[PDB]
Swiss-Prot record:
The chain holds residues 25 to 212 of 304 of the full protein. The gene is NCR1. It is found in: Cell membrane. N-glycosylated. Keywords: Cell membrane, Disulfide bond, Glycoprotein, Immunoglobulin domain, Membrane, Receptor, Repeat, Signal, Transmembrane, Transmembrane helix. It comes from Homo sapiens. Selectively expressed by both resting and activated NK cells. This is Natural cytotoxicity triggering receptor 1. Belongs to the natural cytotoxicity receptor (NCR) family. Interacts with CD247 and FCER1G.
């Protein structure tokens, strides 16, 4: 009946503790009420006025903390009907406690075709590790292991070029400090 809303974070979902993030919810033009929900509770509300030209609302979150790391959703109202929930957004808090180390095999400089594997180590956390690829063409990989996890990339191409940082975690939504970057140079 009502177009399903859409939720996303800005800049992205990895929020360093004490820092800020903005959660955006898109509903529909004219909607008079938007609610941001967090783990079964009401987090924030926004009532567009005038609503005719508005179809999105921004929820600002300053001073990020682990108690705010989790699953968010959004619903909006037009008249007396409420919409179905939006997609589920997971916010994680970073820079918690320690700093893991990152290493790569065979080395930081390779030619297309060489199999590359990254290794993240942190002995004071859980088995869940994460490999982040900086800049554009960004994304996050996850790996598991005791004290250390590996992230094999298989044969690489120049597309694998970029800066990498890894994270350790204390639970699925609470991550450590990013590791020192490793700039992978691919030739060929």
């Amino acid at each position: 009946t009502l177009p399903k809303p859409f939720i996303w974070a800005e800049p992205h979902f990895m929020v360093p503790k004490e820092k800020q993030v903005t959660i955006c919810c898109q509903g529909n033009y004219g909607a008079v009420e938007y609610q941001l929900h967090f783990e079964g509770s009401l987090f924030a509300v926004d009532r567009p006025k005038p609503p005719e030209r508005i179809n999105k609302v921004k929820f600002y979150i300053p001073d990020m903390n682990s108690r705010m790391a989790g699953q968010y959703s959004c619903i909006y109202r037009v008249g007396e009907l409420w919409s179905e929930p939006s997609n589920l957004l997971d916010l994680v808090v970073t820079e918690m406690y320690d700093t893991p180390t990152l290493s790569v095999h065979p080395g930081p400089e390779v030619i297309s075709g060489e199999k590359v594997t990254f290794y993240c180590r942190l002995d004071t956390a859980t088995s869940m590790f994460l490999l982040l690829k900086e800049g554009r063409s960004s994304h996050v990989q996850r790996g598991y292991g005791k004290v250390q996890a590996e992230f094999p990339l298989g044969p690489v191409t120049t597309a694998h070029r970029g800066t990498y940082r890894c994270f350790g975690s204390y639970n699925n939504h609470a991550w450590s400090f990013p590791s020192e970057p490793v700039k992978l140079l691919v030739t060929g």
